[PDB]
Each structure stands twice: as structure tokens, then as C-alpha cells.
Amino acid sequence: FIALNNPFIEVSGAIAALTAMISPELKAANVGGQIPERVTLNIGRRINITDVAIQDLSFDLDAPRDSNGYFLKNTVNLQLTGSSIYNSSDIVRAF
Amino acid sequence: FIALNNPFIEVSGAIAALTAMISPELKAANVGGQIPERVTLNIGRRIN
Amino acid sequence: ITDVAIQDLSFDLDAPRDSNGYFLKNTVNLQLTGSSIYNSSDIVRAF
Amino acid sequence: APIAYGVYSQADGVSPYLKVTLTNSQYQVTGYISQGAAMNMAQNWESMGSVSGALGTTSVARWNSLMVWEGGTPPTFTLPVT
Amino acid sequence: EREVGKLTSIIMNKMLFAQGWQFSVEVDGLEGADFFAKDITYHDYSIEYETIKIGGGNILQPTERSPGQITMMVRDTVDGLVLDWFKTAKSRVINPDGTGNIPSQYLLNVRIYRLLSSGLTKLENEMTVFPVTTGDVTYARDQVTEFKSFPMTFALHSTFNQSSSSLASLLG
Amino acid sequence: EREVGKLTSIIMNKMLFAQGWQFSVEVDGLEGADFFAKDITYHDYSIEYETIKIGGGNILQPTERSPGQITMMVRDTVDGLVLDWFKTAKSRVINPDGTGNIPSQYLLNVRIYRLLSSGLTKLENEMTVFPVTTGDVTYARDQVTEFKSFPMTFALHSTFNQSSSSLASLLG
Amino acid sequence: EREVGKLTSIIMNKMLFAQGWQFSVEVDGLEGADFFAKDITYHDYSIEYETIKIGGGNILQPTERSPGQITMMVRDTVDGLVLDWFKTAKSRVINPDGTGNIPSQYLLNVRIYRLLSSGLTKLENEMTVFPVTTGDVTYARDQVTEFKSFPMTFALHSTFNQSSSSLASLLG
């Protein structure tokens, strides 16, 4: 991510959003709402996979800063995995 | 792979084809069809 | 972040020294960890 | 009241946005940030798929096949202060 | 034969090739850059390729368009205005404390012109750049017969958007 | 046309471009640096960027302001004073034993001026520097018609605080 | 104005800048080095620093003082004495077998002098060095109008103790 107009909604907000998406929610009433939720991955416009689970995440802390203290650039490393083994006919549809 | 005339047939279809060849078929009725299919490899024209 | 635990530390012993024997520069490598599994709503507050 | 140490003063001219502070009931330490800091978090999901099956009551079977959530890890840091 | 030479001379004389003194440059913050400017070198983008080895042959494929730069060598008056302008422009890119500003504040536009006959101009290129730095200045004692000079070098921001800038830059 | 040339000449005559012998330098402890000085070369900061590759295009983002350096080439008298001053200044940075002193002791200030008409001066830049080194001296046998010379090179301490120094340096 | 020029001429004429032929060198083992010597270049120590990156700025800190070297280009007579002296001095540093001697045996002292008016001298520097090597010698056939020459280069032992040597060296 690199900021051009508003650093908070571009660089300093996306990191918090990812950090929230990776975590569970243990105060929910139902059992299924406590598990970390799953996301939909769409690489460009041509590869789309559903029910993707986020496993790892990382980012640096020596990025350039704005006069107000928000990042002007950052980089996040992610590892993602599927939730089931795919059949030969199903995996072709993903492309 | 590198495209020269039609990118879909040459570069973007080959990857989908390989991803199809690697995976099994678990909705099949018989037992032999549930294991991923085997392939014939030919390296150039002299090793089969 | 509150309630962090320090689990490793290191520093150099070949740093520049003063005429009285004190360091003029050094560097410390630290490894830190939280003390509980954060919830989705809690972790956003840290930012 | 804790005891101060490090580069806490403002005589050097660097913004407080470029410093770290560690505070407890006894000591307060301030330092800079070097070139190799990062923040990491991780979660555990469970490798081998399975076989002798596939399936055309039905819903429960698939739920077992789906990856399971096992546990997590609190955030960790690697900070080279200076 | 000489007939071919005569025909070539006839065709060559009619068409007037451009000479080397027809350039003109306008900068946003100098209002007088044309008089002070002496030299300028610029290139906008360059295609970068990758070589792929297949057997006993090679095939290339373009990948990128690398950014460019602009540098100029300006003369200066007594009680220098150009040096002060460059200093002020350089200062905005990064605050002395160690913080950086948003892109809209420090960017500027540079325009390169071509001179037609009878004092008419056309636009060659437009680029958005940030001041980068100035190389080095000497100020020797024996330079009795020479004027002051120093180079100013800029760098383009992004290849996606060369000329067009945000609303903040346009409206001030 | 010639009218345009005449107008440009009229414009050019009125404005006086600065010549190369208008520099002036003062060093803290020399007291006579201006007479001995021959050349300078200073650049204060330079802005550094990072190139980020996105698909088939590039975008840059400034990161730093790197420090600079000052060098000068002084003539010397019989029974050298400038040379002894340089050795004394160098010796204070690091003690012969192998221990270093606090920054307040060895730092020094250099001012570079601009000479207006009728002998009036204005400040161009001010920097805090430490003596670093002097490269090489030759003292050849056959240099019958040349004066002695040697270069002195300094390095800027910190970009955060270029000119202002601690109270200890100011009050002695 | 011309009055400033007259004052500058008056002040400049009085002070006599040192010329380039006033050097003098004494070596421990030549007893005639002054006549044979032609060139010499020397630097004693140089401060080395480290750049530390903090955010968007840089701060330096001195760390070391690197050693120096001395090299000289001497003429030689027929039945060379200088070459034999350099060969003998070089041989002591390492025995032909492959063993090294203790430092006291091969070290030597070199002194650089400055020439005052009326044939008086002062000491510029004193260094303790070991012979290192000589670069290369040509001995061409067509050099009918040139004398023989070869360079001798020394290296300083330790920055802690530049001039003072052990008792064995002093008393022989």
C-alpha cells in the first residue's frame, strides 16, 4: 500500500482491518461466530476462490511517517490456505 | 509458456489444464477413477 | 499494548567508549510478546 | 514515580513519532527504531486430505472434512532499539 | 553521378533542419527560468525487457517502463533567488525532524518547449517531479572570468500519471 | 528577428549575474581563513527515494535526507599555522589511547557567505562539522614555481540540527 | 572599488606564503637521504565514522583512526647504495624460511622537516614504519636523457604509539 491523498484510509487503516480479520471474536453468542471468519480472494479479475482462511501476517515498523504520525507506505506479507480439497472439475472453475 | 498470437490458448489455459491434471475426481462411481489420472511424459522426442 | 513480556535481549560489547569508560553508542535487540489471545474488537483499539 | 533513561529529552530534534518507550512501575526507557522491526501474528489451521469417499445427513459429513481451527498465538515484536 | 548530387542538394536545401538553440523551459516557481537556464537533459520512460533462454535461442518480452529525470544548470544573480527557491523547494519534501509530507505539497510541474519560426512555441513534454538535490558547488578564487553555475536535478514521481496532477496542486 | 534579439539584449544588460569570485568563508579558530582559502565544495543534504514496482509501472517515495561534507584548499605560510590547527583539531575527536570524547568538545562551525556589491555579505549556509582527514601532500623537489597546498575535508554531524549547537559550544 | 584592492595587496604582500621546495626528510639508515630524495607523500591518521539511520534522518559517530603510509622516490648512484639498503631492510621483516621476527628488529623512524628562512628547520611529523615493498622498475633502452628512479613505500606500525619506540630501538 502507498498513500497519495489520505494516509489513514489507505495505509494506516488497511493494516488494522487485516489485523481485525485475522483475529477471533470470543464474546459472540453463537459458537460459529467465535471462529475467525473466512474471506473471499480475488487476484486481479480472473482468479476467485471462496472460503479462504488467513494463517499468518506480518508488516514492518520502520516505514516513513507523516507529520501526524501515520504511515505513508507499508508492506504486508500474508499466507492463505483453502478450506477443503478440490476436485478436478471444481478447480477449473476457479480460473 | 509465452504468448505470441492468442494468450488464452497458450499461457492462461495451460495453467488451468495442469491444475486440472493434478487433482482427483471424488464424485465418480468407480474406485479407479477416484485417484488422480496418470500422465504420459515425452521430453523432446527421445525419452518416453 | 499493555502487559507485554520480554523474552530475549542482546547487545554488543565492542562499542565506542568514553574517557571515563562509558558507552557513547550501542544497540539492543529485543523480543516481545503479548500476554493473551486478542479478540477482533480488542485488537483494533491498539491502533 | 518511575526513573527516566535513554534519549527521552527533546534536545536532539527528533520527533516523538520515531521513538519507543518501555514503562513499568520502576523504570522508563526510551530509544529509537532501527531498520529491522516488524510485528507478527499467527493462527493454526489443520496437510493430507482424505479418501475412500467423496459423497454424491450429508451436511455433517462435509463439516468434518472441512479444515479445523486449533488455536492461536498472541502478537510478537522484534525491536532493535538504538 | 553529379545529377543525383544536384537533386539531393535541391531536396536538402528546401527543408530546414532544427538548430540547437530552440529550446525553452518553464518552471512553476521561478517566473524567470528561461533567462537563467543554460542546459537541460531529460528522458521520460524506458522500456525494460527480460531475456528467456529456450534451447539454443533467445526470446525477449517487455516488462516495465522505468522512470526518468530532469536536470538543469542555471546561472544566478547577486543575492541569489534561484538558490533560495531550490532550498525552499527541497525543504518541503522531508521535514527536518524526520517526517514526510503527503505528495500533493512538494510536487511541481516542468514544461519543455520547442521554438517554431517567428517566435511560436509548442509543447514537447510535461512531467511532475520532486527537487531531489544539487550536486556540488566550487566557488574558486581564480574564477575571475566565469559566472556562477550549479546543477539542479529532479526525478519523476510515477509513470502511471506523468502530467496530470491532483486538484490541490491545480487550484493551489 | 533582430527586434527580438535587441529586446533580449536590453533585458540581459540590466540584470547582473554573479561572478565566481564572490565567495567568502569563516572558520571558528583560524581567524584568517579568508586569506588562506582558495576553494570550497559543500553540499548540505540530498533526498533519497525508493522505487516501488507495481505491475508494469513504477512509483517512487522519498525516504531520507543524506548528510553532506565540506572541503577546502588552503595555502600555508612558513612555520605552518593552519596545519598545526588541523592536527590539533583532529586529535580531539579520538584520543590516542582509543577512547572518544562527548560530541560537544570536537565540533566546530563553518559559515559560507555571499558577497553583495560594495562589500556587503549575506549568509549562504551554516553547518556543524568534525575534522575528518586530509588526504595527501607532495612537497616535490621540482615545484620551484608553486606554493604549498593541502585539502581539508569535514563531515556534517546531524541533519536534524544543522546550525544550532549546544550551549556548551556557544559559551565556551 | 580600487581602495579595497590596494588594502588587500598591502596585506597580502607582507605575509610570505611557503613555497613547494622547503621540505626535508631524514631516514635512520641512509645518512644521505636528503640528496637522493625527490618526492614524498604522507598522511598519519584518518578518522572513520559510522552512519546511523533514525527515521528520515542520519546521525554520524566517529569510531576509528586508520593508519597511514609514507612513500618516496629516490635517485641512485652507480653501484647502488639505496637499493642495497632497501633490500637489506626488507629482508629483516620476514626470514626467507617463513618465520617472522619480533617488532623491535625491523622497525625504523622517518622524520619530515619544514624549512624556515635562513636555513633553519622544524619537525613536522615523526612516524615508525616497516619497509613494505617497492613497486616496479623499468630500465628501458631508450632512456638516454633520464636518471634512474624507483619508489619506496612504508607503512605505519600502530596508531597508539606513532613516534616513541622501545628501548632496544633507541639504544641499539
* Closest in C39, C44, C47 to A24, CB measured: C39
| Nearest-Cα residue of chain E relative to residue D19 | E98
Cα–Cα distance, A71 to A62 (Å, whole number): 9
Please state the length of chain B.
48
| Nearest-Cα residue of chain B relative to residue E61 | B2
Asked if the Cβ–Cβ distance from D41 to A55 is below 8 Å, we say no
- Residue D79 φ/ψ, nearest 5 degrees: -120, 110
Q: What residues of F are in contact with residue D19 (Cβ under 8 Å)?
A: none
Inter-chain Cβ pairs, chain B and chain D, closer than 8 A: 8
| Nearest-Cα residue of chain D relative to residue A65 | D17
The x, y and z cell numbers of residue D50, run together, are 482424505
Geometric angle at alpha carbon D34, from D28 and D39, rounded to 5° = 80
Question: Contact, C40 vs A23, CB < 8 A?
Answer: yes
Q: What residues of D are in contact with residue A69 (Cβ under 8 Å)?
A: 17
Of the candidates D3, D45, D35, D39, the one whose C-alpha atom is nearest the C-alpha of residue D22 is D3
Query: How many angstroms separate the CA of residue G40 from the nearest CA in chain A?
Result: 49
DSSP string, E22-69: -EEEEETTTS-HHHHEEEEEEE--EEEEEEEEETTEEEEEEEEEE--E
Query: How many angstroms separate the CA of residue B3 from the nearest CA in chain E?
Result: 10
Distance of CA F78 to the CA centre of its chain: 25
Grid look-up 487503516 returns A13
Query: How many angstroms separate the CA of residue E170 from the nearest CA in chain G?
Result: 28
HEC states along chain F?
CHHHHHHHHHHHHHCCECECCCEEEEECCCCCHHHHEEEEEEECCEEEEEEEEECCEEEEEEEEEECCEEEEEECCECCCCHHHHHHHHHHCCECCCCCECCHHHHCEEEEEEEEECCCEEEEEEEEEEECCCCCCCCCCCCCCCCECCEEEEEEECECCCCCCCCHHHHHC
Of the candidates E96, E98, F104, the one whose C-alpha atom is nearest the C-alpha of residue D19 is E98
Query: How many angstroms separate the CA of residue D75 from the nearest CA in chain F?
Result: 28
Of the candidates D33, D29, D22, the one whose C-alpha atom is nearest the C-alpha of residue D6 is D29
Does the CB of C11 have a partner CB in chain A at under 8 Å?
A: no
Query: How many angstroms separate the CA of residue E65 from the nearest CA in chain B?
Result: 20
Does the CB of D42 have a partner CB in chain A at under 8 Å?
A: yes
Geometric angle at alpha carbon G113, from G71 and F90, rounded to 5° = 75
The x, y and z cell numbers of residue F72, run together, are 577546502
Cα–Cα distance, A28 to A23 (Å, whole number): 13
* Closest in A35, A62, A84 to D35, CB measured: A62
Q: What residues of B are in contact with residue E59 (Cβ under 8 Å)?
A: 2
Question: Contact, E40 vs E64, CB < 8 A?
Answer: no
Cα–Cα distance, G113 to G42 (Å, whole number): 12
CA atoms within 13 A on the CB side of G149: 11
Inter-chain Cβ pairs, chain A and chain B, closer than 8 A: 27
Cα–Cα distance, A11 to E104 (Å, whole number): 16
Grid look-up 581564480 returns E142
3-state helix, strand, coil in chain D (%, to 5): 15, 45, 45
Residues 6+ apart with CB under 8 A from F71: F39, F40, F41, F42, F151, F152, F153, F154
* Closest in E101, E103, E104 to A67, CB measured: E101
Resolution in A: 3.2
